[PDB]
Amino acid sequence: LPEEVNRTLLQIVQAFASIRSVAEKALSEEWNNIEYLLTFLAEQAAFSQDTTVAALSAVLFRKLALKAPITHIRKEVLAQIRSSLLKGFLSERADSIRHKLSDAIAECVQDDLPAWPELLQALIESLKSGNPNFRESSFRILTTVPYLITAVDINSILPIFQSGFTDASDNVKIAAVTAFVGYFKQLPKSEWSKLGILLPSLLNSLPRFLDDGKDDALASVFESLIELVELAPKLFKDMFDQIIQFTDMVIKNKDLEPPARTTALELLTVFSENAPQMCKSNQNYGQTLVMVTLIMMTEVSIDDDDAAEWIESDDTDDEEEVTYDHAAAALARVALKLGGEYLAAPLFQYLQQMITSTEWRERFAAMMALSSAAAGCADVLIGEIPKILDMVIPLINDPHPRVQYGCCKVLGQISTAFSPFIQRTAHDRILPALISKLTSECTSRVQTHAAAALVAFSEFASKDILEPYLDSLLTNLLVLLQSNKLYVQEQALTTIAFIAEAAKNKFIKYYDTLMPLLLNVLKVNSVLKGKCMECATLIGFAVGKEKFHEHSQELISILVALQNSDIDEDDALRSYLEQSWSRICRILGDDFVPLLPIVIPPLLITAKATQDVGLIEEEEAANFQQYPDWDVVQVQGKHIAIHTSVLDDKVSAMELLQSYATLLRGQFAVYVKEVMEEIALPSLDFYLHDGVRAAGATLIPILLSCLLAAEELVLLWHKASSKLIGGLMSEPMPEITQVYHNSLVNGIKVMGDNCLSEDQLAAFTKGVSANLTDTYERMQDRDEYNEFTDEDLLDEINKSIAAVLKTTNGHYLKNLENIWPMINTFLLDNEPILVIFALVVIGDLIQYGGEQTASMKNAFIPKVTECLISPDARIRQAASYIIGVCAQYAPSTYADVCIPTLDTLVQIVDPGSKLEENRSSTENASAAIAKILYAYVDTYTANWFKTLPTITDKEAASFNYQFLSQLIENNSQSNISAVVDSVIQALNERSLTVISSVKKLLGFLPSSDAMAIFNRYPADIMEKVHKWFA
Secondary structure, three states, X not given: OOHHHHHHHHHHHHHHOOOHHHHHHHHHHHOOOHHHHHHHXXXXXXXOOOHHHHHHHHHHHHHHHHHOOHHHOOXXXXXXXXXXHHHHHHOOOOHHHHHHHHHHHHOOOOOOOOOOHHHHHHHHHHHOXXXXXXXXXXXXXXXXXXXXXXXXXXXXHHHHXXXXXXOOOXXXXXXXXXXXXXXXXXXXXXXXXXXXXXXXXXHHHXXXXXXXXXXXXXXXXXXXXXXXXXXXXXXXXXXXXXXXXXXXXXXXXXXXXXHHHHHHHHHHHHHHHHOHHHHHOOHHHHHHHHHHHHHHOOOOOOOOOOOHHHHHOOOOOOOOOXXXXXXXXXXXXXXXXXHHHHHHHHHHHHHHHHOOOOOHHHHHHHHHHHHHHOOOOHHHHOOOHHHHHHHHHHHHHOOOHHHHHHHHHHHHHHHHHOOOHHHXXXXXXXXXXXXXXXXXXXXXXXXXXXXXXXXXXXOOOOHHHHHHHHHHHHHHHHHHHOOOOHHHHHHHHHHHHHHHHHHHHHHHHHHHHHHHHHHHHHHOOHHHHHHHHHHHHHHHHHHOHHHHOOOHHHHHHHHHHHHOOOOOOOHHHHHHHHXXXXXXXXXXXXXXXXXHHHHHHHHHHHOOOXXXXXXXXXXXXXXXXXXXXXXXXXXXXXXXXXXHHHHHHHHHHHHHHHHHHHHHHHHHHHHHHHXXXXXXXXXXXXXXXXXXXXXXXXXHHHHHHHHHHOOHHHHHHHHHHHHHHHHHHHOOOHHHHHHHHHHHXXXXXXHOOOOOOHHHHHHHHHHHHHHHHHHHHHHOOOOOXXXXXXHHHHXXXXXXXXXXXXXXXXXXXXXXXXXXXXXXXXXXXXXHHHHHHHHHHHHXXXXXXXXXXXXXXXXXXXXXXHHHOOOOHHHHHHHHHHHHHHHHHOOOOXXXXXXXXXXXXXXXXXXXXXXXXXXXXXXXXHHHHHHHHHHOOOHHHHHHHOOOOOOOOHHHHHHHXXXXXXXXXXXXXXXXXXXXXXXXXXXXXXXXXXXXXXXXXXHOOOHHHHHOOHHHOOHHHHHHHHOOOO
């Protein structure tokens, strides 16, 4: 560099340590100059004797070299920069500076950059150096630029890693493992088999960390191995037992500090999430996992045998019980993946023993383990339920209050995991057990947890089941209500609320005494009051409006006070208040209308939150990640920070707006324009958060329907429908695409006839085509290393097509021709889901195309007649519906098919026909033959009859009993009790004036003959029969 340039730059870069903003401007405004600057910073990083200037420049070089980019730099310069960076690397640098140089070097290696064989050469040599920092930095560069691993000869690179894993320096070891795993995460699988052979060297180097007593570095290695399990679990198959036994050995060594033990556990557990067939095939995995988690769950209340503190603390979790926490989450996670088939047996082997230990911590552990495993092992444990209670319930009264708390937890957790069966079956055992912990004989923590577990029970308990226990439940909870710790009172209110919600009308009895207790609590602590208001309005919904009106006015005045009071935190309160207002609206019906000006404005504010995004820089993201309320993602290389909490809050507000609109109907009309234009619609352009986009879409038809019920409607609908249609081509998530289709369907049902314009119809077609294209392409996707959203999307596209055909009244058949190639490929694909989709489109075509489909007759009836006898019941269903609809709307043009196939229908109708799983299919066939018999000798109709009654499909049933009513009133035994029953069953099962026809038939018989038909029927259906007949 020219000598002047140097002292200019030297001054500036020196200003950076500390004057610093003036230097920042100078760089970004002035520094035509980029290659000079890069050349300078690489010189400083390389040769400067000042640490800080060296570091800075290295980091700056790294940043500016991406931005340039390095590609657009002059080869003559690149070379000089490469050579000074390399000279700096091999000179004498501080460790931290070598690391920074390494990262700068890495910015100079690129597929389309000129080859740099001096770097490879320098790495091969540095890996053999006696200075650990040279060795470490070489693996670092292979970490950042894994492709260099491809560029070394295989017979050099393999010893480099084997040496790496075995190195004297832990830091070199960590870097070797990092680079090894990095290789897999960066390169395609076709390259994997080239390092994969090294896994055993790695695994075999693991015991050395325990010999050196270097378990903290073990933890780092475990972390890289955890990533390798996510990428290539099958790689570990051959040495599976050796990693299992090794992690067993580490976890048991309670002398190690927790990180080596918790990361070892995570290694163990992650196999279950990435290779479930693998761990299932190995009996050792499940057994080690359970054994190991039971041990860790024992590590509680350490140095506090009486649990004194623990008793004197409050119901939040002690987050310092780390190994215990991780073990419970591990057990849970593994149980969820592997199931009880595989896990119950090993679990129970151990529980039997620990339940009876004199060590309280082991009795606790056993409760907590069941609690963690129950959901996951539900499939098997739902049948071993008295056995479980026989083990757990005796401990409800354990000397030690933590075992008691533990037992409350399991009873709670199991009530939810084994629901609804356990409520029906074990109320007699569970409720007394829990109720007895409510009494003030027990400790605060235990009473509260028992009350918590009663919520879990109640959630799936009948009003009828809870009824005999309410007085007892209530009297005990009211005591807790007067408790003296906050958390006991809070939980008392929540438990009462949720019991009340389950009790429904059976709670009317307790209303007079409870509500003033609650008013007194409110008139006196934010969470308490919010939980109190929640309890009041849940009680209100349980007992109904009339009853709730005795206190509603006062309640509302307290709500208002609570909402509009100075202190705005707890933020926890806002939500209790919102749900309460909303629940008062379900209670009050239209009498809520006067309250809208209190309740809606805050929800409008929250629901208009913008996409609160920070287009951000590379370092400025990991600290932005610290916040629970924020997440950072990458879109197209560029990084962005998104305020997740705020967007979540937006959704929640939109959900409330949507449910007020749904209940208030026409009364909500005043808000429709504002919610639609400022909330619903702009929410579809929220490309960073799909919840928002979905909540936007679902709001649309409900908004319209509110306006309808009360020109603008048409304007909003046109704007809304257009944004939905356009969304179909641009939306990347298939799950969202479905919401838009569903949203359109619902919109079209609101708006009625001819609600879409011709350009809209054509734009919907392109959307439908792109969506069908992308679904085909995803399904033509599905290994050496690894082990309904499509059906749902297609289900909805069928609904939108049907809906659009109906609104156009056929005219959409024109547009529909453009995507016929698509529909056709589907129809003759192998994949049953695409086939069913196509069949369903075809059925809709004929409904509207009538005899206007002849164009295609010759092209799809061949496959439809196939489909008729398909082993798949859903394919028969769609096919037969097509055949039936053919005779209905396109009669004259389809008899060459309908009448032949008629025998096929007699067959499809007849082992496992009348059976839940194919009852649906054979009902369509049944109606399909009735349709043919109507359009166009008598042997057939006697067949048809033997397929009544029609109970499951509503449109099919609609036709069959319409037909059954013609075959009588305009036509012509001992079929009379089968005739009647066929009808009673249909009505009773809620599938479908056929009654008028039946009466006349009963007219043809003696009073006594007529009355005996009903003999069979019990009271409940004879109550209904009386109210059905003429």
